Amino acid sequence: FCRFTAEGVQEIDYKDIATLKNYITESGKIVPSRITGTRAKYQRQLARAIKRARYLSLLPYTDRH
């Protein structure tokens, strides 16, 4: 409930998978904003950062890989 990208400052980078793996669940799905608490601007950046890191094989699409 204490949104992390609105707290300091951010544009959600796709390369730093350290913070980016905090916002995926165990099966590779993106966690909704009602759970984490991110602002909706930082949620649209996040999904575009998950999917672009899922492209470059940094994060997985699913756990069936």
């Binding site: 165990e26 099966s27 799905k29």
Partner: protein, 65 residues
Amino acid sequence: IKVRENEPFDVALRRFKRSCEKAGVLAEVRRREFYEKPTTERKRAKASAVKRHAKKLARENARRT
């Protein structure tokens, strides 16, 4: 989805199935494209959720109990 439950466990308790995929997003895809009711029943899901939100806080009456 996937659970390992390191060698002394004695019981499965796969609780991430009710949290990820098991029958929620699978009974939804077993039939019925609809193309139309994900506009209609998504509306009625949240039309009743806001009457679960507003009418629950203002339910404070005497009611003899």
